[PDB]
């Protein structure tokens, strides 16, 4: 039906720029009246200055070659062969040509437990001892010193004090803080070292091998590798041995070993007897878990078969 | 989504959609042809030769009528509809157009599209009150001083920013048809760059009514001749479209203008503001003084803190400055037997009930002090003990202590 003039469009939106203005719209609600195109009337103060006509398929237009920091009134008319419809009016001021922080100081690491460390820092920018009046947020990163090129774990903090969660014991950590406000951003602060507190081991010692001594069959050599989850400095190891594997933990013969050693010798044992062995690690905090039983039969005597 | 509040619900500045306040409005005109039907002439230049085509203006026939309805109807370029004045109403006589809006609008532009040639002298006025008093807006003339007693192309200074300027820019007789006179309010004004914080210009753009008066007609010179019959029928004022563009004045406290109970247009006030233009704070929301909303900060009104004990509150500037420009509200007539600036304590002669909170109605219990037994009316706020006379004991002071006998004298009870 081209007997009537097109109706007013359903919506009109304007986004301003330095020398441009982005006009975005939606077609009129009543699809009954045929629309041939759209007319965009723009100008400083009044929308009469210039007129741009676009096709019916178009839903956006960028008005180019405009003066910066100027208030523009834009109109959108839907038009066909009988005329131009009721306009949607919208105005926008063009943005100016001009397009655009010190890192925290006195970063100190305060260790509380094996998994949590408190980080404190002061600002020279703020006049008072502590001031949270501006919309500024801090970003703290952490990584292990032992492995090369460790992936940084970032966490955003609101206050000057932050507690780090999910950390491994007996590992050195480095920390860096940075203040961020708006578009501008500052670099990382001076790295502060913080070693986690020692903890009771959670893993038993690995690679447990029992081999009898060359020449002396009554003596046996037990070899083992240190456990993965040591959680602290190694102070020693305890070896348990018994002829019956089903026997209670305290019925097994206690053998004390020093922290430096990873191999121990067990003397005065019965020949042609199957022995079972269980080892556990220890630190300054507690006693680690016992390893799985390792069966090893002692050699047969010269007598009989 | 609501424009007056953010994603979290925090208030933000909201402005009503830019509209043509003139569109579809009744415009009162001083003169219109066709009453009785009269001939009018359209001059079309053929170089030096001035060809003329005459037609008839007849109000009684819609095909030949030019009503003031054509000023604000759908402006179609194919089928132009324009109001037309009576022929030759030359100076001192002036055709006047008056647009009335029952609401304050921050007008950005006023534009007139013409069917006949643009006038020699034209004037735009505004009304601050609802049509009672008029204030000049903009003047147009080839002789600015001799017509409107204003200098031609006056320089706009920081002092007089509300000055009505006179110009010769859109006065030209040619084009004889389709000529446009568009007035931009904030154009040339020095504070325009920072309008949001300029109350001088916030006031200048504000108007309830708009009046356009065409003082002088453009003529070829045949007007003062013996055979002036055909010549005078060629001169008239004709406006195809009248636009008054701007926004409903809501001081950034309302996203839309809604029709009121008295059928007049008012702001759909948000940010705890009230009044037609959101110019004031909603009753009981007088904690801080009212302020117009800006793009940087939305200045919402804050409700008085009365611990749910007062419906009415007042303000005190001295106290506001004492809080460090944070709060200056004082509660009025605290209910549920409470007293104070915020009704934060019990009335003189009422004790604080430690069980129930301060917000509750039963927060204050009556001392119930005996008029004979007790000495004072006000009791202890914590324990509930009333100051009894010599030899008198009890919370209400109604008992005589062990060893004391009740006497007839009012001064000494026990
Ligand atoms: O304005 S008047 O009605 O008083 O007529 C005065 C003279 O105008 C003519 C032509 O002279 S010209 O304009 O210089 O060309 O007639 C023209 O005016 C009427 C009314 O105008 S209108 O736009 O229709 O409102 C028209 O008559 S009518 O449609 O009302 O019935 C003429 O159109 S038509 O010829 O009837 O189709 C119109 O003619 S034109 O298109 O402009 O050329 C003269 O009338 S004419 O000689 O019969 O053409 C009038 O001069 S006259 O000596 O009184 O006859
Ligand atoms: C919070 O931290 C993450 C770290 O990946 C970052 O991507 C995000 O942008 C931060 N939040 C804010 C509000 O900047
Ligand atoms: C004016 O219009 C009315 C209604 O159409 C008509 O009766 C009358 O004759 C018209 N006058 C002239 C002079 O044409
Ligand atoms: C077209 O314009 C004429 C005046 O020239 C007017 O009388 C009429 O109402 C307009 N609209 C239509 C649909 O003819
Ligand atoms: C002309 O305009 C003045 C105001 O400028 C007004 O008082 C007067 O009534 C108008 N009409 C005439 C015929 O003077
Ligand atoms: Ca019209």
Author numbering:
A (entry chain B): 765 to 864, 869 to 1073
B (entry chain A): 38 to 451
Sentences from the paper on this structure:
Neogenin (NEO1) acts as an attractive guidance receptor when the Netrin-1 (NET1) ligand binds, but it mediates repulsion via repulsive guidance molecule (RGM) ligands. NEO1 is a single-pass transmembrane receptor belonging to the immunoglobulin (Ig) superfamily, composed of 4 N-terminal Ig-like domains, followed by 6 fibronectin type III-like domains, a single transmembrane helix, and an intracellular domain. Secreted netrins comprise an N-terminal laminin (LN) domain followed by three laminin epidermal growth factor-like repeats (LE1-3) and a C-terminal Netrin (NTR) domain. Structural studies on binary NET1-DCC and NET1-NEO1 complexes have identified the three NEO1 membrane-proximal FN domains as the NET1 binding sites (Finci et al., 2014; Xu et al., 2014).
We next determined the crystal structure of the binary complex between NEO1FN456 and NET1ΔNTR. The observed NEO1FN456:NET1ΔNTR interfaces are equivalent to the ternary NEO1-NET1-RGMB complex, with NET1 linking two separate NEO1 molecules via their FN4 and FN5 domains respectively. The NEO1FN56 structural unit is positioned differently when compared to the ternary NEO1-NET1-RGM structure, undergoing a rotation of some 130o around the FN4-5 interdomain linker. Interface-1 and -2 determinants resemble that of our ternary complex and are also observed in a previously reported crystal structure of the chick NET1ΔNTR with NEO1FN45 (Xu et al., 2014). However, we did not observe a 2:2 hetero-tetrameric arrangement as in the chick NET1-NEO1 structure, mediated by an antiparallel NET1 dimer. Crystal packing analysis of our binary NET1-NEO1 complex suggests a continuous NET1-NEO1 arrangement generated by a crystallographic two-fold axis, mediated by NET1-NEO1 interface 1 and 2. This suggests a ligand-induced receptor clustering mechanism, resulting in a similar arrangement to that proposed for the NET1-DCC complex (Xu et al., 2014). Our data support a cell surface receptor oligomerization model in which a single NET1 molecule links two NEO1/DCC receptors together, leading to NEO1/DCC clustering in a concentration-dependent manner.
